[PDB]
Amino acid sequence: LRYPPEMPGAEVKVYKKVDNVDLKLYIYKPADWKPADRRSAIVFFFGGGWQSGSPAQFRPQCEYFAGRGMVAMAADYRVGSRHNVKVADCVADAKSAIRWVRQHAAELGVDPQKIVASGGSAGGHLAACTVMVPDLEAPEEDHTISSQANAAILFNPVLILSREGLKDHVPRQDWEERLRERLGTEPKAVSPYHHIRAGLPPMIIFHGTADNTVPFETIRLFAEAMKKAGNRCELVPFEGAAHGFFNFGRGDNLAYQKTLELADEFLVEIGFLAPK
């Protein structure tokens, strides 16, 4: 991956201006798209530890879901190696992207109730924040336009960022390098696990059982508590797989293809996509 990304064929829209930075969305429209359509939309947030990464990461998945009739887009957002930001600022940007899509739904040919948030690792954390973590919104935006996505598709997300009240040991990962200094809030306020509650949008999660960066057990524990609150939260283990297994180009694109087929199935299940 490179940054800045190259996104051939995508329509570029600035979704947020903050600190003289123009944050872009890269939009892939389906065949036969028209503004009066009411399609489902999916917004991908790249991974990179809230420090690096590129919107090109989910370019293959954008093209797949646009081919299936969705308005698919990859959002840029601020990251620590490029901008003086902390995790909470990344959350603000992710929420700004969902709110912008909803706000512009009529010009995008999108149903404002069928907006899917998706991402990998830190970007999966951001997607989860847009469905369940309160607040952390851009202070000057219209908060009467909801920034909450209507579903989520998460690729080995980070979902626990605090260890308080939390169950048993959680090992020391070098990416928690006292990143508490680069969270920008008290850790619970950016930790999806600590905002589990009834009435949340449905999601599906793909995670490798041999993930040594984000322990699978944190995700299993998250999914169990979400189910207990009545939420549809499907965790699909990829047996023996490592962090990042799902990316285009990893393996023989087998996990890549499988996650797309399962994500597709999930979107047909919840009514956001017609069968093939």
UniProtKB/TrEMBL annotation:
Q: Which Pfam family would be a valid example here?
A: BD-FAE
Give the record's keywords alphabetically. Answer: Hydrolase
Specify the signal sequence span: none
Q: Can the keyword Hydrolase be found in this entry's annotation?
A: yes
The BD-FAE-like domain extends over: 27-225
Q: Which InterPro entries match?
A: AB_hydrolase_fold, BD-FAE-like_dom, GDXG_lipolytic_enzyme
Q: What is its EC number?
A: 3.1.1.1
- One of the record's GO molecular function terms: carboxylesterase activity
**PANTHER family, alphabetized:** AB HYDROLASE SUPERFAMILY PROTEIN C4A8.06C (PTHR48081), ACETYL-HYDROLASE LIPR-RELATED (PTHR48081:SF30)
Q: Which family does it belong to?
A: Belongs to the 'GDXG' lipolytic enzyme family.
Protein name in UniProt: Esterase
Species of origin reads Thermogutta terrifontis
